[PDB]
């Protein structure tokens, strides 16, 4: 058995699955969605364990949906701030504060690919995401497959 | 221990008062006791004639650190402006305003204000400070210029 804090501290596909069949609800339940920065952190930690394998892919996608639905459905949640901070932590947009960009964008891009296809996703954010995913960047260039996939999906939003 | 910064700023004030570009404003704020606060200046930059920024007067604050001129001042538009190189916080980005880039202890306030004025109609889009303006600039140039004109009219003195 596992717990949410342990998973977030040291993310792994195995720990996500060990959270149980209700892992998606637990991730959202234990995340303070009133804070954009914390939602960005949870989103990236969860997406960091994405693997193109049935059980893991479903677990990551479900977790992202539970988390983002909860965050986006708060009329007070600033979705623009979320997008901005997400881009900063992904190393695609500069910031005034110091942040060490994540090393691998594979999971985050695949998680985003799924997220933008859901009803809870604010379509107004699509153009901004598209702008920064198409913009030149070495991290993205090394994640070509995931990057192309996300862009093709964004064209359909 | 701001003595060196204050010595330099007192001279910059004298120089600016003797001669500065027409339409521009740069004046030290006042402390509660009535004396000058040379570390915090209230400035204003006029939009360039012949550009979509014409007619507007854009207010900004210049903040100097105790180690100035080893470090550049922090310049922030108040209120924040719609522009690819202006953070949502209002902070303006320019190579001459970055200690690790083109800032040199010798750079003057006049050079900075003129540099920012130049930046207004000639945005360096390579590394944007905000996702909103960058996105619009890249996806619909006419719409971008339309928002710039509206903003210039809004801040017309």
Curated annotation (Swiss-Prot), chain A:
Intervals of motif SUMO conjugation: 93-96
Organism of origin: Homo sapiens
Assembly information from the UniProt record: Homodimer. Interacts with RAN. Forms a complex with RANBP2/NUP358, NXF1 and NXT1. Forms a tight complex in association with RANBP2/NUP358 and UBE2I/UBC9, the ubiquitin-conjugating enzyme E2. Interacts with UBE2I; the interaction conjugates SUMO1 to RANGAP1, and subsequently stabilizes interactions of sumoylated RANGAP1 with RANBP2/NUP358. The complex composed of RANBP2, SUMO1, RANGAP1 and UBE2I associates with nuclear pore complexes. Identified in a complex composed of RAN, RANBP2, sumoylated RANGAP1, UBE2I and XPO1. Identified in a complex composed of RAN, RANGAP1 and RANBP1.
Name of the protein in question: Ran GTPase-activating protein 1
Modified residues (N6-acetyllysine): 94
Post-translational modification: Phosphorylation occurs before nuclear envelope breakdown and continues throughout mitosis. Phosphorylated by the M-phase kinase cyclin B/Cdk1, in vitro. Differential timimg of dephosphorylation occurs during phases of mitosis. The phosphorylated form remains associated with RANBP2/NUP358 and the SUMO E2-conjugating enzyme, UBE2I, on nuclear pore complex (NPC) diassembly and during mitosis. Sumoylated. Sumoylation is necessary for targeting to the nuclear envelope (NE), and for association with mitotic spindles and kinetochores during mitosis. Also required for interaction with RANBP2 and is mediated by UBE2I. Desumoylated by HINT1.
Site location (Hydrophobic interaction with UBE2I): 132, 135
Tissue expression from the record: Highly expressed in brain, thymus and testis.
Protein purpose: GTPase activator for RAN. Converts cytoplasmic GTP-bound RAN to GDP-bound RAN, which is essential for RAN-mediated nuclear import and export. Mediates dissociation of cargo from nuclear export complexes containing XPO1, RAN and RANBP2 after nuclear export.
Subcellular location: Cytoplasm; Nucleus, Nucleoplasm; Nucleus envelope; Chromosome, Centromere, Kinetochore
Cross-link (Glycyl lysine isopeptide (Lys-Gly) (interchain with G-Cter in SUMO1)): 94
Location of this fragment in the whole protein: 431 to 587 of 587
Modification sites for Phosphothreonine: 6
Crosslink (Glycyl lysine isopeptide (Lys-Gly) (interchain with G-Cter in SUMO2)) position: 22, 94, 156
Highest taxon listed in the record's lineage: Eukaryota
Family label: Belongs to the RNA1 family.
Modified residues (Phosphoserine): 5, 12
Swiss-Prot record, chain B:
InterPro entries, A to Z: Ub_conjugating_enzyme, UBQ-conjugat_E2_core, UBQ-conjugating_AS, UBQ-conjugating_enzyme/RWD
Assembly, per entry: Forms a complex with SENP6 and UBE2I in response to UV irradiation. Forms a tight complex with RANGAP1 and RANBP2. Identified in a complex with SUMO2 and UBE2I, where one ZNF451 interacts with one UBE2I and two SUMO2 chains, one bound to the UBE2I active site and the other to another region of the same UBE2I molecule. Interacts with SETX. Interacts with HIPK1 and HIPK2. Interacts with PPM1J. Interacts with RASD2. Interacts with TCF3. Interacts with NR2C1; the interaction promotes its sumoylation. Interacts with SIAH1. Interacts with PARP. (Microbial infection) Interacts with human herpesvirus 6 IE2.
Functional description taken from the UniProt entry: Accepts the ubiquitin-like proteins SUMO1, SUMO2, SUMO3, SUMO4 and SUMO1P1/SUMO5 from the UBLE1A-UBLE1B E1 complex and catalyzes their covalent attachment to other proteins with the help of an E3 ligase such as RANBP2, CBX4 and ZNF451. Can catalyze the formation of poly-SUMO chains. Necessary for sumoylation of FOXL2 and KAT5. Essential for nuclear architecture and chromosome segregation. Sumoylates p53/TP53 at 'Lys-386'. Mediates sumoylation of ERCC6 which is essential for its transcription-coupled nucleotide excision repair activity.
Annotated phenotype, changing residue 127 to S: No effect on catalytic activity
UniProt protein name: SUMO-conjugating enzyme UBC9
Enzyme class: transferase
PANTHER family reported for this sequence: UBIQUITIN-CONJUGATING ENZYME E2 (PTHR24067)
Annotated phenotype, changing residue 61 to A: Slightly impairs binding to RANBP2
GO BP terms in the entry: cell division; chromosome segregation; mitotic nuclear membrane reassembly; modulation of chemical synaptic transmission; negative regulation of DNA-templated transcription; negative regulation of transcription by RNA polymerase II; nuclear export; positive regulation of canonical NF-kappaB signal transduction
Record bears the keyword Transmembrane: no
Site, as annotated: Interaction with RANBP2: 4, 25, 57
Keywords associated with the record: Acetylation, ATP-binding, Cell cycle, Cell division, Chromosome partition, Cytoplasm, Host-virus interaction, Isopeptide bond, Mitosis, Nucleotide-binding, Nucleus, Phosphoprotein, Transferase, Ubl conjugation, Ubl conjugation pathway
EC code(s) of this entry: 2.3.2.-
The keyword Endoplasmic reticulum is assigned to this record: no
Covalent link Glycyl lysine isopeptide (Lys-Gly) (interchain with G-Cter in SUMO1), residues: 49
Domain UBC core: 4-157
Phosphoserine PTM sites in chain numbering: 71
Gene name of the encoded protein: UBE2I
Resulting phenotype, residue 57 to A: Impairs binding to RANBP2
UniProt source species: Homo sapiens
CDD domains, A to Z: UBCc_UBE2I
């Amino acid at each position: 058995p596992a717990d949410v804090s342990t998973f977030l501290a040291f993310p792994s596909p195995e720990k996500l699955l060990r959270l149980g069949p209700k892992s998606s609800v637990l991730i959202a339940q234990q995340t303070d969605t009133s804070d954009p920065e914390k939602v960005v952190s949870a989103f990236l930690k969860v997406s960091s364990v994405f693997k193109d394998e049935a059980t893991v892919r479903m677990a990551v996608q479900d977790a992202v949906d539970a988390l983002m639905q909860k965050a986006f459905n708060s009329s007070s949640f600033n979705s623009n701030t979320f997008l901005t901070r997400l881009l900063v932590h992904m190393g695609l947009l500069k910031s005034e504060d110091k942040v060490k960009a994540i090393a691998n964008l594979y999971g985050p891009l695949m998680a985003l690919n799924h997220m933008v296809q859901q009803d809870y996703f604010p379509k107004a954010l699509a153009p901004l995401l598209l702008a920064f995913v198409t913009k030149p960047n070495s991290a993205l260039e090394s994640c070509s497959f995931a990057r192309h996939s996300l862009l093709q999906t964004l064209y359909k939003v | 221990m701001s003595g060196i910064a204050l010595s330099r700023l007192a001279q910059e004030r004298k120089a600016w008062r003797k001669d500065h570009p027409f339409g521009f404003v740069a004046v030290p704020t006042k402390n509660p006791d009535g004396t000058m606060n040379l570390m915090n200046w209230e400035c204003a930059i006029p939009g360039k004639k012949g550009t979509p920024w014409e007619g507007g007067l854009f207010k900004l604050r210049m903040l100097f650190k105790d180690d100035y001129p080893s470090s550049p001042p922090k310049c922030k538009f108040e209120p924040p402006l719609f522009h690819p190189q202006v953070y949502p916080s209002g902070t303006v980005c320019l190579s001459i305003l970055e200690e690790d880039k083109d800032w040199r202890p010798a750079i003057t306030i006049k050079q900075i204000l003129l540099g920012i004025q130049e930046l207004l109609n000639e945005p360096n889009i390579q590394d944007p400070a905000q996702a909103e303006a960058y996105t619009i600039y890249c996806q619909n140039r006419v719409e971008y210029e339309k928002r710039v004109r509206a903003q210039a009219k809004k801040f017309a003195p």
